[PDB]
Amino acid sequence: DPIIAKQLFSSLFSGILKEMDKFKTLSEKNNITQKLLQDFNRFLNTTFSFFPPFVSCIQDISCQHAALLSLDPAAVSAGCLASLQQPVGIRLLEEALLRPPDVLRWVELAKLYRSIGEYDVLRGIFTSEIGTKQITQSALLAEARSDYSEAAKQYDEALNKQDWVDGEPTEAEKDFWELASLDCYNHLAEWKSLEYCSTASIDSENPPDLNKIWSEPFYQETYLPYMIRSKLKLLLQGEADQSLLTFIDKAMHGELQKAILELHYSQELSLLYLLQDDVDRAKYYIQNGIQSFMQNYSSIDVLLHQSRLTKLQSVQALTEIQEFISFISKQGNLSSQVPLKRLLNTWTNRYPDAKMDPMNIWDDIITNRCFFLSKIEEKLTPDISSLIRSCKFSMKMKMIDSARKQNNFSLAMKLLKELHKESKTRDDWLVSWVQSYCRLSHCRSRSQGCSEQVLTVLKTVSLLDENNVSSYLSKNILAFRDQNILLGTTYRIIANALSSEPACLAEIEEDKARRILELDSEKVIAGLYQRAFQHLSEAVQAAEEEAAGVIDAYMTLADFCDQQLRKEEEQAYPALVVEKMLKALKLNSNEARLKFPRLLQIIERYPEETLSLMTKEISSVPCWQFISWISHMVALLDKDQAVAVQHSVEEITDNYPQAIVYPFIISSESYSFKDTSTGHKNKEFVARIKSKLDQGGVIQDFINALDQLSNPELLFKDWSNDVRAELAKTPVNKKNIEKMYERMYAALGDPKAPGLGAFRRKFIQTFGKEFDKHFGKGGSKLLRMKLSDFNDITNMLLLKMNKDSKPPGNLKECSPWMSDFKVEFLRNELEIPGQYDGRGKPLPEYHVRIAGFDERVTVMASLRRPKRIIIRGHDEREHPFLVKGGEDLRQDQRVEQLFQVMNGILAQDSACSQRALQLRTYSVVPMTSRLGLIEWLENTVTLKDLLLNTMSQEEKAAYLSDPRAPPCEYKDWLTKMSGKHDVGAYMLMYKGANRTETVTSFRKRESKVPADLLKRAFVRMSTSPEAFLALRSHFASSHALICISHWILGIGDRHLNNFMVAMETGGVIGIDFGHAFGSATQFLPVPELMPFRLTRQFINLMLPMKETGLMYSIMVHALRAFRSDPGLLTNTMDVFVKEPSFDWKNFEQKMLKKGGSWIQEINVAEKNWYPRQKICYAKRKLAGANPAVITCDELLLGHEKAPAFRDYVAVARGSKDHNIRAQEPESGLSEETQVKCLMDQATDPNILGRTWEGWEPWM
């Protein structure tokens, strides 16, 4: 076995070199390591058969020793690029670039990263702080998008330049320009500019190639593959030009020129000898190629994917060569065309996969097949001259349809202009031609600015409305649906283009303005919207004669009319949206399942008609597609338009009586119906479902038993604050105190009031048996007290009720209903919650039932002190859940539902699905008010505990027990800067230290922690350099995703225990959304001014690069996908304004008096003032806003009339000398500039030097 030989040799070598360091003192071992370094250089420079577990064998033992690290940047790259072992060479060069710029290694590392895609990391490489020119970054930007015709232009316009008055463009960068221009000419089909550029650098005046490539082994590893590839791919058609066969013949006389060919090529050789009309040598060469594929593919390592994919992507060309050899040899399949038709019918169904195979593979297979067909047309001499062209046309058009999807517009355009001379012969060819043209133009003009984006979609007008209907569009129906849905999008593009910069773009033309006018500054928009509406309506008037082919024709017209209505907000369109969306929701479609609050808002905003239209369409829909919006519908089951919701709530309550149970109790806690004729039907309907649910009370005892184990002090503080915020301000509210005292009367009253309604605790039977000598005075005077002045009498008893308590109950006998749960009868086993996640038929038989609880309940040491229970399933498996005492967990549910909408909109965007970006969520149920459950996560650990267990024993001891530690140094700095030990020092410190004091102390506090903690934690558990590059990249991508997604809905308090890392995949999980919109910079005493957490460890993980290559392009991609359609998240955000939670009402009174924002009307509560303001703030920062403008706006709304307020606005705005966020406009920003100033605000020592001490900004 080769692989265990590689692992045994690489273990034994390292073992001997690590054991020799006892004796053999320091003057001899230096010479030993120098000789070993020269031997390894000799191996890498003289090898010619790049065997993978030998090439990647010496680079694993060299990159671990400090003496062999300076090995050979020019041979390492050329070996790893050819043996496909690139994650070992990347780690070798990145360990060399640690420990004048090192432009050689900085160019070879870029050449290793460029070969496997990975254009994200190539932004933190090519800067001007390593002496590289600025023609490299501008040319890599045109290759990060598939635009290999401007980069191949401005590489040629940078090679032959002699001015260079900044320095000198060194020879390593010129080798990089030559290699990258070679690949950019390779990615197209220019087979003259790859031939001349490859045979015009070794000799002059028509080079012979005959021995010039075989000397000086740098001109052989680079200039030979492109020479033979360009010459062969030009040989496979056209004229003779006999100059490669003679080179092969005079090369094969040697030995090292004979075992370098036919070991690395074999396939170009087989094609070259098939070109010479002999099949016998090609048989030997293709058998050699098959054996070479097998011996190479069985040798590259196990956990090294995409090398296996790029090696497996050649088997179709190999076996098509073998099938042509086997077809042409026999005689029974060369007389009759019956085995020919089976070949032409099996060729047109064996394409490679579109969107997943690069265009060199498609070019290989298509040119091979046309060469084979041209040979078979002569060898099969006994209408047959048409059935091959009808195969070649439909083989090239699929290649075009895959070149369009990968943004190869410059490659697809020449294929269109070559497939045009013989397209007008028949009739069903032209429609596919013009539709490929029109889809190419619509895909191409998504990036141009204006006035040329108008011009290309104006050019694809005159051919879409050609004759084209000579019994074809009337007869066929797909060719009639597709031209209508294309001609709708053309006019939509024009009329949306002339509506941002209206006047000038209709003026910068000479005849195209008249051509647009034949289809004043408002007729040319309204008459084009009408022409869009006609061609989008025909696409469903003529497509109801037949899924996934009518869902697009529905949802196109639905989204166009919905955006037109949202533009009218600032005919029968609100009627036309609802039925065309519900007909596509009836068929299975996830893109219409998330557009439900748009319907439930258009019904509320347009109720004069279309409210009867929702009834007949919601009547016949399978009622498992609303289990996402059950909490969205049970809040509409209090107010008007409850019809067309009532039927679906009744159906779900009938046939799924476990999904809608728990969202019904929270809405039944507070309804307060009206007094009309409909207001009585609403009460009888809610009373019918209240009688129908709970099936005899198996749910209510579960909810009560999970209520009766929490600490009573939390509900005690709830009662105390609810009476203090209702009596001690003004006694005008009638019956409210005597109504809110009933819960205090029921629970924690006389010790039998819980004993008669529920089960007696083992802890309340000690608590209420002691708190009755203090409850006698309550039963005397506090029943009708109405004094409203004294609260110290409550203060002394709440301070005395925290001494003789024990919040551990120490077993599950503290709530003796689950310890004696003991199911024995079919009493509707109650199906452990948090299931029915969204879509599909739920299949409720596979769902886990509750069959008991454990005796070990534990307590988490947070503020509100939640508990954790271990509930056992019926199949004997534990489930950990987290019960919370008395907080309304509906904001957590709403933001996790928002995360579900977020990673539903991520998977539709094409650029993010290739990176596989998904937010990882978890389940939360608000059972009743002041009671919920949270799914505890297994196999994870907190980020702070990972960083606190990665250190050494001398590190944590001198980090926690040191007077100069960054914990104590920040406290001493705050004492010195202000004068006081408590809070208020944060107020006076803004009026204390200036800018150039905070930074100079922050670097001293920051450079006292170790700098390699995430790298140590990721190298302790990776076991391979091919896996380190996977784990660290996955960690960085997941953290970039949650950093950009915790800002749109503005989440604060991102401290060091809100991040969970999975110890089996290396990915970050964000939790604990207590502050969800801007409420850490608005209601906290000392504010927070950063948008997310990007501290020193997250940027020190990515050395020798920094956080501008990988943690930048992920944020650009995710935020561009969010700002693709901005309507979805703001439409989901209206459940806050429909049924507002208590957390948006306990501070609404605080903003009512001690706050700001008097520009808007404050007389209306929770319909226009609070949640409409949070929605308009998120809509502003989703339409493009400065991240320092939103912070000072939220700081003006909540922190005005402060002592240090202008200091707050001065800190969080910029400085115009260090910060890019001060040199930008306040609004109307762009995407990359917005994320640039966004990442500028996060890492700022003028911000991070002055924050709250528990956020820990130094680590």
Curated annotation (Swiss-Prot):
UniProt modification remark: Autophosphorylated at two clusters, the T2609 cluster and the S2056 cluster. Autophosphorylation induces a conformational change that leads to remodeling of the DNA-PK complex, requisite for efficient end processing and DNA repair.
G-loop: annotated span: 859-865
Residues in PI3K/PI4K catalytic domain copies: 853-1184
Modified residues (N6-acetyllysine): K398, K417, K752, K769, K773
Effect listed in the UniProt record for changing S10N: In a metastatic melanoma sample; somatic mutation
Location of region: Activation loop: 1070-1095
Domain FATC: 1227-1259
Disorder this protein is connected to according to its UniProt record: Immunodeficiency 26 with or without neurologic abnormalities: A form of severe combined immunodeficiency characterized by reduced or absent T and B cells, recurrent candidiasis, and lower respiratory tract infections. Some patients show dysmorphic features, severe growth failure, microcephaly, seizures, and impaired neurological functions.
Family: Belongs to the PI3/PI4-kinase family.
Protein name from the UniProt record: DNA-dependent protein kinase catalytic subunit
Organism: Homo sapiens (Human)
Residues of the full protein shown: 2801 to 4128 of 4128
